[PDB]
Amino acid sequence: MSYNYVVTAQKPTAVNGCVTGHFTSAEDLNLLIAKNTRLEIYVVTAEGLRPVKEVGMYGKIAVMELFRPKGESKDLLFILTAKYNACILEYKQSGESIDIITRAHGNVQDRIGRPSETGIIGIIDPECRMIGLRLYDGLFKVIPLDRDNKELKAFNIRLEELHVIDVKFLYGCQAPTICFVYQDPQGRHVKTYEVSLREKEFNKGPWKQENVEAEASMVIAVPEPFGGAIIIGQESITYHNGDKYLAIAPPIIKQSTIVCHNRVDPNGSRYLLGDMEGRLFMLLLEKEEQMDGTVTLKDLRVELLGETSIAECLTYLDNGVVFVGSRLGDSQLVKLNVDSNEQGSYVVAMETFTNLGPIVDMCVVDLERQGQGQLVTCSGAFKEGSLRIIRNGIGIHEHASIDLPGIKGLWPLRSDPNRETYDTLVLSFVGQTRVLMLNGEEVEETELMGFVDDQQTFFCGNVAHQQLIQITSASVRLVSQEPKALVSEWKEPQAKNISVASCNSSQVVVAVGRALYYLQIHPQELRQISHTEMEHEVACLDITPLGDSNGLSPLCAIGLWTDISARILKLPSFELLHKEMLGGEIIPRSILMTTFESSHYLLCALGDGALFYFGLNIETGLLSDRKKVTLGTQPTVLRTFRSLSTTNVFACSDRPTVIYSSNHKLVFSNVNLKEVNYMCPLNSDGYPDSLALANNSTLTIGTIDEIQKLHIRTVPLYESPRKICYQEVSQCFGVLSSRIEVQDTSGGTTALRPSASTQALSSSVSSSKLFSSETSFGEEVEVHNLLIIDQHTFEVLHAHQFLQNEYALSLVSCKLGKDPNTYFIVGTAMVYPEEAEPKQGRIVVFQYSDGKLQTVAEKEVKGAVYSMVEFNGKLLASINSTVRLYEWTTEKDVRTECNHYNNIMALYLKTKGDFILVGDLMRSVLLLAYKPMEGNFEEIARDFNPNWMSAVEILDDDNFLGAENAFNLFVCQKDSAATTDEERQHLQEVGLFHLGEFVNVFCHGSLVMQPTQGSVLFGTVNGMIGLVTSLSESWYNLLLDMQNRLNKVIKSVGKIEHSFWRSFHTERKTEPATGFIDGDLIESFLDISRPKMQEVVANLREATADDLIKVVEELTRIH
């Protein structure tokens, strides 16, 4: 009985790979960035990066190189997956659309062979003669790249060298030559082989085998004008070619390990090198032009250019710009300058891109105290360490709220000449019009000697010539602004109510039923120009300069009444241009024509809740892009606001929505408000970049946040955060962090930079004497702290430092025993350098009150305290293969009963309100319940068959979620079978599914606000935030069917079956997925085309596309 649903909440933000070339067009410079399962394509330009296509793969990308075979117009992309999916790709965009076509594809998995330390390595020979894969110890796969072999049939060559460190094909060879650094006793060396694909063998290197530094770990092939290879290790860098050898031991490098490199100049003359500690260096190869032998190379040299944030991936874009691809911190675009600046850095940050980085731990908390939910995460590592608050939707800060009922409309008001901005706002009612005034934040009501106070207004804008138009239903008026009066007044030649308004600034378009009059605001006078009548009744009109016109407006858009029609037509005349009939009998409420960028847009909202979106030429009006997307259930009221430069539309509805721009589409995210019936933008003096917003019965103004479906706040810490616990009563968080210091001259550890725990506002250091038992004069130590962060400011209120070599591993916020107070409790371990497994630890009790952090109680323990949780009233801790329950004395002391415990090593632990427990010992999951007799736990049940756990969660009384270090998820369940002794002792695994991420933390909570059931989010190493829910058996089945029908249709990038991708996979076993659905796949159903869509949804059970789009949209709202 297990039936679960997973979706991505936030795609991965960590950068794993990033290569450079011309994939789009021969003469076009791209940057290809690899996330885990995301390939992101950019075109480099003057500003920075212009995006073009963002695909997702059904696998983790492990190798990403570009290359161009003979007779090949631009470069192809080669990619290998972690699950051994090879493929070559081509970028094809001709038409309006773009496509990654799959030239070739195949699975290079080998039945035998064990995965080598350093992992999958993928290289391509310089004349593209082959693909070189190192996947397994003692094996080198070769893929011939000729014109055929569209299946990437490879062959293997035996490799006598059991442990390879790195490998690249060498440059300038009359035959595939590979250069590698392997290891055997005797240290490590660099050997060579030629590759005969005429007969599958290695031949013999173009040169002999030399030794290398024990830590040689990167091989670099340098191009033809020098050839040879560069070998980087610690404390030395070297050059190898033939009987040539150079080498340098620049001390600058001895410190951290060089981790990545990238070619600056194609001469091979310069290279970027990145540290673990984030230093960027420039390597430079000193040429020498000899008489008329050739161009040789004389010497190497390394210069520190500065620091970037820890680089995984590094890539000289162009013109001194470099992309920094980070996995432990934010990525960035950075400029190299020739002169150094202040700080003496040749590097300068131009742009930073968010990385939720390693989510090491998290929790959900309603920070604003509103029924919604926010994620707060411990993110990053070392200097890149931080907190992120992720919050859903766009929000708006409120200032003035008037208890004002019934409002049918809202238009700006500038009561002065051309002195800019606005000072009065006008509110259409029911059958009235009541003007205001603003001497600031003041909101009095007095009218104008020129508008009507008993005539519902349909418009209240500005024009020219000292003029304020008020289109009433009875009469398009015109007001004098200096004298303050009536300049003129228009009236339907019969006396017929104006049904629908429309006024830009320099011109008008009323409609009185099916007829239309066009009137111009000329010098102190209205000016009739036209009359046409429509096949049906007019529901709504737009006039607005959509481009190359300063108020005199070309077109006129329209939604009609019986046939549900939308139409664009030429205003001077009203001649029909062309139109789109839609469905149903629900009429259009609103229609809008607004431009954002290099696409002109025409939007049409129905009155059931639907919205449809159009392409328009400013010039003709061709029936351009169309698809049914829904919003609230009420009629939307479209409208135009001022944001930044990229100004946009607000959708008023029972579900307030914004339409922004991203790559070149228009965002579609929620505004976090009850319901907005109408809204006009603003500038006004007492309320500056505001917006006004009515409803049922209120009025308010205010600004607008970012955009994205998710808002993210960063809180830098300059140090690793490790755990986090909200403590409401204190209105703050606890976060365990560690930082690195070093052995100074006095040995004393010091500090590499200031950071949360050192820069803290208040401070304190442990002072216990519980221990009293050696060090190296120059090395590294970690120093751990508990930080107290205010949930509003996020300042480090207080930082407590632990004992030397004490590591905090676990954190709790709770109340214990009968004590009213709420403590932060921390579990630790004395981590001495040699003897691995901890012999000692502490359980410390801390209190935060009036403003200080007291150290209530202490309690020594005989081992590391890997984790703990507040059970029912006692405190349940896990100490090094032992589980104990602690009682909180009424005298304020934590005490246990050694006659009592359970022998287990719970790395991970959870509890269900009952007396239930989910532990983890030797790769297994266990369900234990606290029996008050034996005063122990009872091992109700476990999951036999290993599983290297990384996270764990209780879904409910009988279902338990597990996450393992193979990127799989699983669900164990208490089997309800006879013989309630043993069958009931083995919890069977009722579900499996290959996630693709590495889960570090589970937690109950949601990000959306106020029918599936249950909700569990998880954070990963890659920054990706997931979500897991339960379903009913019918939904599981409808959806399971859905999936199958869905694969048949959707074209998988590198032609990889979704069924294989999601199939559970650990090196031991391989099974298909079960009790698992990915809404990720399931939500792709919306981006498909109708023709494809009715191809799905064909036999169960009305089975409608429209009907089935409705369920899928109802599932998107889970996040």
DSSP code string of 1032-1046: -HHHHHHHHHHHHHH
Domain extent listing, the chain: 1-14+356-392+710-1030, 15-355, 393-709, 1031-1119
SS3 assignment, position 445: coil
Q: Are 502 and 472 in contact (CB under 8 A)?
A: no
Joined together, the tokens standing for residue 1011 give 């029918």
Of 598, 558, 552, the C-alpha closest to 578 is 558
Burial class (CB in 10 A: 0-12, 13-18, 19+), 834: exposed
Joined together, the tokens standing for residue 705 give 């946040």
The pair phi, psi for residue 900, each rounded to 5°, is -150, 130
- Bridge partners, residue 376, by sequence: 363, 389
Of 94, 100, 21, 90, the C-alpha closest to 58 is 100
Beta pairing class for 629-630 and 610-616 = antiparallel
Alpha-carbon distance of 1013 to 713, in angstroms, equals 29
Of 733, 747, 739, the C-alpha closest to 720 is 739
The DSSP output letter for 1106 is H
CA 292, 298, 302, 308 dihedral sign is positive
Alpha-carbon distance of 865 to 863, in angstroms, equals 6
Alpha-carbon distance of 291 to 293, in angstroms, equals 6
Joined together, the tokens standing for residue 785 give 């702290």
Report the b/e string of 931-963 with b at 16+ CB within 10 A.
eeeeebbebbbbbeeebebbbbbbbeebbbbbb
The resolution, in angstroms to one decimal, equals: 2.9
Q: Which helix (H) or strand (E) holds 313?
A: strand 313-318
After what residue numbers is the chain broken, C–N > 2.5 angstroms?
A: 773, 1010, 1100
Alpha-carbon distance of 606 to 651, in angstroms, equals 12
Residue written as tokens 């002065």? 416
Q: Within 10 Å of residue 110's Cβ, how many Cβ atoms?
A: 15
Obtained via which technique?
A: X-ray
Q: Are 662 and 629 in contact (CB under 8 A)?
A: no
Report the b/e string of 48-77 with b at 16+ CB within 10 A.
ebeebbeebbbbbbbbbbbbeeeeeebbbb
SS3 assignment, position 692: strand
Q: Are 1015 and 1118 in contact (CB under 8 A)?
A: yes
Of 99, 98, 114, 103, the C-alpha closest to 79 is 103
Order of strands, sheet of 710-716, starting from the edge strand that comes earlier in the sequence: 359-365, 374-379, 386-392, 710-716
SS3 assignment, position 1111: helix
Q: Are 60 and 71 in contact (CB under 8 A)?
A: no
SS3 assignment, position 1075: coil
The DSSP output letter for 406 is -
Alpha-carbon distance of 512 to 515, in angstroms, equals 6
Order of strands, sheet of 432-435, starting from the edge strand that comes earlier in the sequence: 409-411, 426-429, 432-435
Beta pairing class for 1076-1078 and 4-10 = parallel
Q: Are 988 and 945 in contact (CB under 8 A)?
A: no
- Bridge partners, residue 318, by sequence: 321
The pair phi, psi for residue 729, each rounded to 5°, is -50, -35
Of 543, 540, 592, the C-alpha closest to 564 is 540
CA 447, 450, 455, 459 dihedral sign is negative
Alpha-carbon distance of 81 to 812, in angstroms, equals 40
Q: According to the 3-state scheme, what is the secondary structure of 266-292?
A: CCCCEEEEEECCCEEEEEEEEEEECCC
Report the b/e string of 768-801 with b at 16+ CB within 10 A.
eeeeeeeeeeeeebbbbbbbbbebeebbbbbbbb
The DSSP output letter for 729 is G
Alpha-carbon distance of 648 to 656, in angstroms, equals 14
Alpha-carbon distance of 193 to 175, in angstroms, equals 10
SS3 assignment, position 1060: helix
Of 561, 558, 560, 559, the C-alpha closest to 571 is 558
Distance set, CA 823 to CA 392, 726, 817, 888 (Å): 30, 11, 11, 12
Joined together, the tokens standing for residue 390 give 């992720």
Q: Are 787 and 756 in contact (CB under 8 A)?
A: yes
Residue written as tokens 């629908």? 500
Query: At the fourth CATH level, which superfamily is domain 15-355?
Result: YVTN repeat-like/Quinoprotein amine dehydrogenase (2.130.10.10)
The pair phi, psi for residue 1107, each rounded to 5°, is -65, -40
Residue written as tokens 């409401």? 728
Q: Are 1026 and 995 in contact (CB under 8 A)?
A: yes
Alpha-carbon distance of 621 to 485, in angstroms, equals 40
Residue written as tokens 């929000």? 395
Joined together, the tokens standing for residue 212 give 């290398």
Alpha-carbon distance of 552 to 509, in angstroms, equals 12
The pair phi, psi for residue 787, each rounded to 5°, is -100, 145
Domain spanning 393-709, CATH class: mainly beta
Alpha-carbon distance of 301 to 285, in angstroms, equals 7
Alpha-carbon distance of 1037 to 588, in angstroms, equals 37
Alpha-carbon distance of 641 to 795, in angstroms, equals 35
- Bridge partners, residue 659, by sequence: 649
Alpha-carbon distance of 1063 to 1030, in angstroms, equals 20
Is CATH 1.10.150.910 the right assignment for the domain spanning 1031-1119?
yes
Alpha-carbon distance of 3 to 965, in angstroms, equals 23
Alpha-carbon distance of 1007 to 389, in angstroms, equals 11
Beta pairing class for 640-641 and 648-651 = antiparallel
- The single-letter code of the amino acid at 212 is V
Phi-psi region of 174 (alpha: psi -120 to 50; beta: other; left: phi over 0): alpha
Phi-psi region of 881 (alpha: psi -120 to 50; beta: other; left: phi over 0): left
- Bridge partners, residue 765, by sequence: 801
393-709 shares the fold of 1-14+356-392+710-1030: yes
- Concatenating the DSSP letter of every residue in 12-52 gives -----EEEEE-SS-TT--EEEEE-SSEEEEEEE-SSSEEEE
HSE-CB of 566 using CA atoms within 13 angstroms: 29
Distance set, CA 170 to CA 135, 190, 255, 840 (Å): 19, 12, 29, 53
Alpha-carbon distance of 654 to 1011, in angstroms, equals 19
Alpha-carbon distance of 502 to 511, in angstroms, equals 9
Joined together, the tokens standing for residue 989 give 């695994």
- Concatenating the DSSP letter of every residue in 104-169 gives EEEE---SS-PBPTT--EEEE-TT--EEEEEEETTEEEEEE-SS--TT---EEEE-S-SEEEEEEE
**Whole-angstrom Cα Rg for the chain:** 34
Residue written as tokens 């082989």? 193
The fold adopted by the segment(s) 1-14+356-392+710-1030 is Methylamine Dehydrogenase; Chain H (2.130.10)
Residue written as tokens 């007095």? 446
Alpha-carbon distance of 183 to 709, in angstroms, equals 49
Alpha-carbon distance of 1066 to 115, in angstroms, equals 12
Alpha-carbon distance of 960 to 370, in angstroms, equals 30
Joined together, the tokens standing for residue 845 give 């009790």
- Bridge partners, residue 283, by sequence: 271, 302
Q: Report the largest interatomic distance among the alpha carbons of the chain, rounded to a whole angstrom.
A: 105
Q: Are 588 and 633 in contact (CB under 8 A)?
A: no
Residue written as tokens 């990308």? 61
Distance set, CA 448 to CA 434, 451, 480, 680, 867 (Å): 10, 6, 11, 20, 71
Report the b/e string of 308-317 with b at 16+ CB within 10 A.
bbbbbbbbbb
Alpha-carbon distance of 1076 to 1028, in angstroms, equals 10
